[PDB]
Design an enzyme around this catalytic site. Structure first.
Site, mmCIF file in Angstrom:
data_model
loop_
_atom_site.group_PDB
_atom_site.id
_atom_site.type_symbol
_atom_site.label_atom_id
_atom_site.label_comp_id
_atom_site.label_asym_id
_atom_site.label_seq_id
_atom_site.Cartn_x
_atom_site.Cartn_y
_atom_site.Cartn_z
ATOM 1 N N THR I 1 0.850 -1.228 0.000
ATOM 2 C CA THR I 1 0.000 0.000 0.000
ATOM 3 C C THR I 1 0.869 1.255 0.000
ATOM 4 O O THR I 1 1.912 1.304 0.653
ATOM 5 C CB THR I 1 -0.956 0.020 1.214
ATOM 6 O OG1 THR I 1 -1.908 -1.043 1.088
ATOM 7 C CG2 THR I 1 -1.714 1.340 1.314
ATOM 8 N N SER I 2 0.430 2.260 -0.751
ATOM 9 C CA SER I 2 1.083 3.561 -0.781
ATOM 10 C C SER I 2 0.019 4.635 -0.641
ATOM 11 O O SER I 2 -0.807 4.812 -1.533
ATOM 12 C CB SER I 2 1.847 3.748 -2.088
ATOM 13 O OG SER I 2 2.931 2.842 -2.168
#
Ligand SMILES: *[C@@]([C])([C][O])[C@](*)(=O)[C]([C]C1=[C][C]=[C][C]=[C]1)[N]C(=O)[C]([C]C1=[C][N]C2=C1[C]=[C][C]=[C]2)[N]C(=O)[C]([C])[N]C(=O)C1=C([C])C2=C([C]1)[C]=[C][C]=[C]2
Ligand SMILES: [Mg+2]
Ligand SMILES: [Mg+2]
Ligand SMILES: [Mg+2]
Ligand SMILES: [Mg+2]
Ligand SMILES: [Mg+2]
Ligand SMILES: [Mg+2]
Lengths: 204, 196, 222, 195, 233, 226, 211, 195, 196
Positions: I1-2
């Site tokens: 995840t970013s």
């Protein structure tokens, strides 16, 4: 250690033409030690039959529990419970112990008194229903029973033919399982007569 | 640890921080992680200091012996010796080495040798615990055929950020320039690079 | 941690007739829940009218077969092209298996052929070398499904003659090759239904005095 | 504790139970009576984990004695055995289960029949002509399978029981210090003082 | 015994009427880090064989060198090294399979899954798999890692059995391979858009395509997806 | 198990295979994995089979009572919210992985649900051991603005991929189509590509083959009069 | 398994069952657990089937070589010791092998128990395997030195039957051997299924079992 | 194996060793002689892990018998005990040690004195007037501490030994099947056939 | 995840990738990680999807109830509710949440709530597995009081790099703009951001 294989035992049920059959071995053991050759694993509540494999204490306990519940059902409903309904009751009763289950493999067999339709069903220890048309198997020789039933079974067998098929499936499966055997019983069930036969088998 | 090697027009530059930790204690704040295996073939070390020192010493020995027999070795040849040690003894080693050198024929070359003992030839390479924080920065700011001054600024800015975020990295920024002109050592102190 | 063993599934079946023998096996190769191949031969003609199958961990099974085939080759060299009898092959295979008593070949091995009197022979092994001659044997994933069926249909176990009521058994009449192949096809069709590792195809090798013959039959591919 | 045996003959039930009690490496007692009278015609022997055995037996004894007083009536051996089984089946899923195996020998005055029930700590009940718990059956069941008849006298039952104890004394590694033998019949419960 | 460090993901392949196709992406992963983006995992051996390798890259580079040395060694004292006594796919495979099974038997495996694709002297197609356990199998379609789970189902719709091979053209087979590589890019977290593809044909020989990209991707429908259940904005 | 969900123009379709297993053994060759929460809200479950049933019947029961209380037709977001909060409470110990689909007055909906309580939204989804084989088909052939007939085809093709290529999946294909402004149509055994071939022999025994010791009539009737 | 062997007036009786197990699965109904090392030497098998077959057939090789070198049959004492020495080389390596070496030599009839620990015991009566306790029960109460060949054969047969019945991992059939000074004599394979019903009726035993 | 006792009196050494041998849950033998004659006036009893005991004893026996033949001379009990200790001390740091405890009873013909040496599997040697291995000493040493004199006769030594066995038979949980008693004196080694 | 949230002149923008993984399998490639707890208070979720969904649902419930009683809640108040849940249930949760909102009084605000349940008010925040790779880039390129177009480019470039290096990150780039003007959703596809 594994509760499902301490005491040993097997149950098998089959459908036929306007009939059902359910059968079990008679052994009760403590692992390698054979303790009883009279431990019947099939019970009936009215005209609905229930076979239970697995941990013997839970087998005994569940029989007493379903006797309890079916006796109350009958007092309130003013009629005997049917196989389809009993099957749901078994499933419900097992799942209420989802995180502390009875270590059992139950098998229901019977004929609907109204529709006349033969019925069998199986469960896992936690209540998942397996409503098969052909046959249901349970116990320490379940793999052996699957192989025998799948090859010997054919649909629409007559009571006296179905008897031979289910007896041979059980007997030969039990003879390839250390924890099953020591006698056997077969119930042949028709809409208004039930015959019970004790089989002759090797006692080792 | 934060280490990197970058090729440019006139050759190649190696860069590194100077921090060595034993847990959270800084055992050495002025470490020299830029180590020489040959005149114009240097390496940046990461991982177990014992392992990487032992390896670089063995490599230095092999290249000294190579030179006595066959003349000046290539940067590729040096990387192959590192690899052969890191790969065959991978079960008992924890070493992440960057190899950098200058030829007149091949000019500046950079090889990276991560944990498993694989070899990868690259325009530039980054390694060490602090490298994770500058993958994005270095990818965005790297160009091929930069000038010496551009390349020094690139390494300085990059390692500045690695030091800023990585606790295992810090101290001074050491650099080694490898060109035809020779070998130039550089040093940059906190008061210079922190304010970038 | 590295696990040197694996399970490639499959099931094999050997039946000995009066003057013939059969060795059958499915052609499916698997790992976990995936299919590797729908046709990967498992039963081999090893020479000298002997057929062999090593079922379980395919890498070990291929190595053992490869070694035995080699053992047959060197038996001819060393003993003036003498024919390796089925009993001699069985004993030889015991020693191949026990050489790895402390790092076993993870396979259930079966060989089939004719004995020195021309009668059908099947020999069965465990992973470490215990062997014995048998009339009927199923090995592999669905062995426990098939063996009871063979006890019943080949050796007529628990079967008695009607009218006597358990006093007189069913007599042990021999089976023809046509009757045996039916039991084999039905055994595998039944095993394919109830076992997920069994299916795709069935290859049967029949051994007579005339030689080794092959028969192939399709199975369900689900 | 170690060994408890039971045999049902023509007109009585015979229970044999070891006398040894061990803590650590020392045999503290060689005359321990591993049994409790539940009612005048019902006897229960027991074996299992230290302490749990007596506590469980006495708890069962109290409950049956309470029933007897309340109804002025002796429960059948079958009824008592079912009560005991339920308590053990209830116990096995408790926070700390009672690790006790029992034999219940009783004479049913209604049916005029002796009855022997074997129940293990899981709540596994079986009615048997002869029974045992733990490793005792491994040595003795072959003798009982051979010699047992249902029309045996009490004296023949004791002789067959002596043979079982002799086999145990020969082939068991543990010294269980002999057995106390008790007979349950129509006249009640009595102890065989010389065995 | 070890653990894989820098890894390559799926290798996929299939047979068609006149040969074989094999493909693999150009990524070298370092756990969840997509570290190296220019890694060739298809390695040609002569003009009749391509070895596709997944798993540990350091072990791949080792195998790459064994094959390079195998070619050198086969040419020694061999006037027919570029003709009758050239290396065949079956020779190359059996060599690797021998090495893999030996290394697992010493409890020091080459942490790889290998597919050897090629065309034999007689024009027969060769496609066989081998891995770190020394397990070998052959099939009209073969795939390693995630490709086994996602690519094989797609490629088996083209060549479901042996009899479908002569009916399958190179254009159809290549199209199926390229589609499978796109699907892997959608769904494999350790895959890359960039990949290599090799065709070995019994007539046209070895065609090695580099710097291929996954194209014609469907993403537009993402704009409409909002929240994880009840959210509307 | 292989399960899929596919949205189309005027609704949503779900499908599943019919194999249930206990290890490598097939217990039931024609299991029904498509469950009903409400008339126009159907779910399909992978993982622990008893959990998928129990949790489906429980939420379906509460959904029915909710529908009666509010005098409204049940919504898919209600089933979704009730399921995830129930599953989250048991922290993944109830091994129910479901694809939930349905139509309600808001429109057509398609959700996936995992055992720990996380939910997802999508136009096409797949769950179970055959999810990867099915998703490969979905990613290859799915498009925007599908028709009812195209979506059923895509759904069953995705299930077939699981049947043929996944050992945990097999036998037949069940389908349920939920179209807006219509009754939901449950198509049990929509496809039947795995019929067992005829056996080579009949194993019907001669009467008297099995040895018997005792026969007896079993009294199943109640106690009689007179 | 269950095996037994005992010395008596007219030599030594050896009796074994024929079952083999792989967990709860009965893998073999009829396995030979006796090895005919030579015409005057027998070896029983209990434990790992592979270990039993390999090492006892290796013993027979070594016992045969003894005859060739010395021109004389090996004693039961020496044969049992060779086997126990083999076990001591693979000491702690995980072998599982319980065996009785039965025979007749110059000292008369001989019987030795040998196991994987290298244990070597001389005695008049032994029983090994998962069902040995059941066999000992019958043997101990019925054994005499003054037994007739007919009664002794029956005792060993009946003792295995006892074990086959109670022990889940024992059964199939009974193999009988009688060792004399003219060599061993095989007294047949006896199916337990048929033997049980026969013994039940004739003897009156197993009253609890219904038939 | 289980219990081995030793006592040195005025003019002899007496060794008592149990007769039981157990595998699994079955006593295979109740007449086992846990001893080997090392030389005419030196006896060694032993106890420890299965198999190792006899192998070690026979290995020692062979070495002493080899020495006797080579030199035509009997080694002193002290010399034999030191040889045995070194072999055990060598063994304890091996890949797989021999798990054997021994008592060495000998009559020194030179000094005209009986001698008893106790050596455990680690190579721990002690000369004692009376000794034991394992748990045997826990029960018996209190009796020996009380009753033992150095001027005791062989008959008094046997009577004190009977008292030790009786105490073991009373307070030990394990049935060791009695003991074989052997006496070592100037005339050599003899077995007491009735005990 | 970013995930990331960035304040600027006119308000605040939340940004995120769209990849959800189960090991190496991408379970969802079009996830919406930008979740609404109030009209102009949104959050970015990282960690256990079950935990973060359960939390954001409870927070949405609390803020809906707050609004019924006391009027529009502040961004600080929303962050406090997140915190109270994340802190008191820290033993049974794995949640890393970024809270972002717009007031007319306080304008754009960003709060980050890492694993332990601490709260940190910041000009901009980054989180998720892919954030590690852009610490250096974001620190070098962030400015206060940027324009909307500048801020969109900053997030796009940043997440582009995070996606490029992190295997757990990918798919489309989703963005939510929070200003006085209202709420604007944005989306950027691979062909756009990969070539940056
Ligand atoms: C009792 C039946 C079981 O304890 C007896 O001990 C037999 C002894 C025996 C001796 C010679 C030949 C056959 C049997 N033992 C076994 O059957 C052993 C018991 C065992 C299983 N695992 C194990 C055991 C013992 C010690 C350590 C570990 N069983 C086996 O050896 C199992 C592994 N073998 C088989 O199931 C098969 C045999 C034998 C066989 C198979 C399978 C297939 C083809 C030929 C032979
Ligand atoms: Mg049996
Ligand atoms: Mg038995
Ligand atoms: Mg199948
Ligand atoms: Mg019991
Ligand atoms: Mg919630
Ligand atoms: Mg990515």
């Amino acid at each position: 250690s594994d509760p499902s294989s301490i005491n040993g035992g097997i149950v098998v049920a089959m459908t036929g033409k306007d009939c059902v059959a359910i059968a079990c071995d008679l052994r009760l053991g403590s692992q390698s030690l054979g303790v009883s050759n009279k431990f019947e694993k099939i019970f009936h509540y009215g005209h609905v039959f229930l076979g239970i494999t697995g941990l013997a204490t839970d087998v005994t306990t569940l029989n007493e529990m379903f006797r309890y519940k079916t006796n109350l059902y009958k007092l309130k409903e003013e009629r005997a419970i049917e196989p389809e309904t009993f099957t749901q009751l078994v499933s419900s009763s097992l799942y209420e112990r989802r995180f502390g289950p009875y270590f059992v493999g139950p098998v229901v067999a019977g004929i609907n008194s109204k529709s006349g339709k033969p019925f069998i069903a199986g469960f896992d220890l936690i209540g998942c229903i397996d409503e098969a048309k052909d046959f249901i198997v349970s116990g320490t020789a379940s793999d052996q029973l699957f192989g025998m039933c799948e090859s010997l079974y054919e649909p629409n067998l007559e009571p006296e033919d179905l008897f031979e098929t289910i007896s041979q499936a059980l007997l030969n499966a039990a003879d390839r399982d250390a924890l099953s055997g020591w006698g056997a019983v077969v119930y042949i069930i028709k809409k208004d007569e039930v015959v019970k036969r004790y089989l002759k088998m090797r006692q080792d | 640890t934060s280490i990197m090697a970058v090729t440019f027009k006139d050759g190649v530059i190696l860069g590194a921080d100077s921090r060595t930790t034993t847990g959270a204690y800084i055992a050495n704040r002025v470490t020299d992680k830029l180590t020489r295996v040959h005149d114009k073939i240097w390496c940046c070390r990461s991982g177990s200091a014992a392992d990487t020192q032992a390896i670089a010493d063995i490599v230095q020995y092999h290249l000294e012996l190579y030179t006595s027999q066959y003349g000046t070795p290539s940067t590729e040849t040096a990387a192959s010796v590192f690899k052969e040690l890191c790969y065959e003894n991978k079960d008992n080693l924890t070493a992440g080495i960057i190899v950098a050198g200058y030829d007149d024929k091949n000019k500046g070359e950079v090889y990276t040798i991560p944990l498993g003992g694989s070899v990868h030839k690259l325009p530039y390479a980054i390694a060490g615990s602090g490298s994770t924080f500058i993958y994005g920065y270095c990818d965005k700011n790297f160009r091929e055929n930069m000038s010496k001054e551009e390349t020094v600024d690139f390494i300085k800015h990059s390692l500045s950020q690695a030091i800023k975020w990585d606790g295992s990295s810090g101290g001074v920024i050491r650099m080694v320039v490898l060109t035809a002109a020779g070998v130039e050592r550089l040093i940059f102190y906190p008061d210079e690079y922190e304010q970038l | 941690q590295f696990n040197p063993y694996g399970d490639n599934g499959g099931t094999i079946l050997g039946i000995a007739g009066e003057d013939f023998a059969v060795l059958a096996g499915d052609t499916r190769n698997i790992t976990d829940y995936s299919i590797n191949s729908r046709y990967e031969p498992k039963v081999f003609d090893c020479g000298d009218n002997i057929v062999m199958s090593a079922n379980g961990f395919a890498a070990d099974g291929d190595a053992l077969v490869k070694r035995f085939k080699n053992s047959v080759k060197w038996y001819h060299f060393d003993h003036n092209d003498k024919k390796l009898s089925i009993n001699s092959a069985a004993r030889n295979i015991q020693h191949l298996l026990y050489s790895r008593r402390f790092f076993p070949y993870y396979v259930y091995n079966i060989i089939a052929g004719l004995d020195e009197d021309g009668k059908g022979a099947v020999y069965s092994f465990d992973p470490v070398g215990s062997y014995q001659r048998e009339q009927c044997r199923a090995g592999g994933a669905a062995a426990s499904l098939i063996m009871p069926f063979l006890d019943n249909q080949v050796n007529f176990k628990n079967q008695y003659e009607p009218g006597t009521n358990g006093k007189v058994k069913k007599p042990l009449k021999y089976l023809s090759v046509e009757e045996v192949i039916k039991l084999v096809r039905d055994s595998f069709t039944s095993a394919t239904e109830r076992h997920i590792q069994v299916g795709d195809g069935l290859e049967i090798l029949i051994v007579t005095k005339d030689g080794v013959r092959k028969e192939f039959y399709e199975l369900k591919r689900d | 504790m170690d060994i408890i045996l039971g045999i049902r003959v023509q007109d009585s039930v015979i229970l044999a139970s070891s006398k040894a009690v061990t803590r650590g490496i020392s045999v503290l007692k060689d005359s321990d009576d591993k049994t409790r009278q539940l009612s005048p015609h019902t006897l229960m022997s027991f074996a299992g984990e230290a302490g749990d055995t007596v506590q469980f037996a006495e708890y069962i004894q109290a409950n049956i004695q309470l029933y007897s007083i309340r109804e002025d009536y002796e429960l059948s051996p079958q009824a008592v055995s079912s009560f005991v089984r339920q308590e053990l089946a209830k116990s096995i899923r408790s926070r700390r289960p009672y690790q006790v195996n029992v034999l219940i020998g009783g004479y049913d005055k209604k049916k005029n029949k002796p009855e022997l029930y074997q129940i293990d700590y899981l709540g596994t009940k079986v009615e048997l002509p002869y029974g045992a718990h733990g490793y005792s059956g491994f040595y003795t069941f072959s003798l009982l399978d051979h010699h047992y008849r249902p029309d045996m006298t009490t004296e023949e039952g004791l002789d067959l029981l002596k043979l079982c104890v002799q086999e145990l004394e020969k082939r068991m590694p543990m010294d269980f210090k002999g057995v106390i033998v008790k007979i349950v019949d129509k006249d009640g419960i009595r102890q065989v003082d010389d065995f | 015994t070890q653990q894989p460090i820098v890894t390559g993901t799926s290798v996929i392949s299939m047979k068609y009427d006149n040969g074989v196709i094999i493909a693999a992406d150009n990524l070298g992963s370092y756990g969840s880090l997509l570290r190296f983006n220019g890694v060739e995992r298809l390695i040609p051996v002569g003009d009749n064989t391509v070895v596709g390798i997944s798993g540990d890259i350091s072990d791949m580079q080792h195998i790459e060198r064994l094959l390079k040395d195998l070619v050198t060694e086969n040419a020694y004292d061999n006037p027919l090294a570029d003709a009758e006594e050239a290396l065949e796919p079956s020779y190359i495979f059996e060599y690797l399979a021998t090495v893999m099974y030996q290394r697992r038997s010493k409890m020091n495996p080459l942490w790889n899954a290998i597919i050897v694709a090629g065309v034999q002297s007689n024009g027969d197609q060769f496609l066989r798999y081998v891995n770190l356990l020394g397990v070998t199998y052959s099939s009209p379609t073969l795939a390693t890692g995630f490709g086994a789970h996602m690519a094989n189902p797609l490629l088996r719709k083209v060549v479901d059995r042996e009899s479908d091979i002569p009916k399958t053209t190179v254009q159809v087979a290549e199209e199926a391979i390229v589609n499978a590589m796109r699907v892997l890019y959608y769904r494999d977290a350790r895959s890359s858009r960039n990949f290599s593809l090799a065709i070995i044909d019994k007539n046209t020989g070895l065609t090695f395509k580099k710097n291929l990209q996954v194209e014609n991707m469907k993403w537009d429908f993402a704009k409409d997806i909002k929240g994880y259940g009840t959210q509307k904005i | 198990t292989t399960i899929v969900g596919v949205k189309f123009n005027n609704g949503v379709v779900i499908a599943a295979d019919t194999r249930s297993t206990q290890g490598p053994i097939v217990a039931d060759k024609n299991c029904a994995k498509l469950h009903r929460i409400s008339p126009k809200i159907w779910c399909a479950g992978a993982g622990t089979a008893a959990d998928t049933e129990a949790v489906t019947q429980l939420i379906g029961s509460n959904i029915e009572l909710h529908s009666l209380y509010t005098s409204r037709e049940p919504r898919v977001v209600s089933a979704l919210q009730m399921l995830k909060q129930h599953l989250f409470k048991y922290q993944g110990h109830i091994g129910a992985y479901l694809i939930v689909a349905g139509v309600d007055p808001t429109g057509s909906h398609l959700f996936s649900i995992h055992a720990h309580g996380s939910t997802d939204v999508g136009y096409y989804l797949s769950l179970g051991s055959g999810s990867l084989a099915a998703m490969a088909v979905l990613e290859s052939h799915w498009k925007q603005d599908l028709t009812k007939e195209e979506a059923i085809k895509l759904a069953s093709d995705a299930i077939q991929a699981g049947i043929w290529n996944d050992l945990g999946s097999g036998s037949n294909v069940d389908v349920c189509v939920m179209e807006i402004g219509k009754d939901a149509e449950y198509l049990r055994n929509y496809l039947t590509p795995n019929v067992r071939e005829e056996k080579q022999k009949s194993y019907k025994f001669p009467r008297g083959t099995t040895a018997v010791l005792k026969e007896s009539i079993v009294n199943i009737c109640d106690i009689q009069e007179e | 398994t269950t095996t037994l062997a005992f010395k008596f007036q007219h030599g030594v009786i050896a009796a074994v069952d024929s079952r083999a197990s792989a967990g709860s699965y009965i893998s073999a109904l009829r396995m030979n657990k006796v090895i005919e090392i030579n015409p005057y030497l027998l070896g029983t098998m209990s434990g790992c089937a592979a270990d039993c077959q390999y090492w006892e057939r290796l013993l027979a090789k070594e016992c045969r070589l003894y005859y060739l070198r010395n021109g004389e049959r090996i004693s039961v004492s020496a044969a049992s010791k060779l086997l126990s020495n083999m076990m001591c080389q693979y000491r702690g390596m995980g072998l599982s092998m319980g065996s009785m070496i039965c025979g007749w030599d110059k000292k008369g009839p001989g019987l030795y128990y040998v196991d994987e620990h290298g244990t070597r015991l001389s005695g008049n009566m032994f029983s090994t395997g998962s069902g040995n306790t059941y066999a000992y029960g019958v043997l101990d109460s019925n054994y005499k030195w003054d037994l007739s060949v007919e009664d002794a054969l029956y005792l060993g047969k009946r003792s295995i039957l006892a074990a086959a019945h109670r022990d889940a991992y024992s059964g199939g059939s009974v193999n009988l051997y009688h060792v004399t000074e003219d060599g061993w004599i095989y007294h047949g394979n006896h199916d337990v299924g048929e033997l049980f019903w026969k013994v039940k009726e004739e003897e009156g035993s197993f009253n609890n079992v219904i038939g």
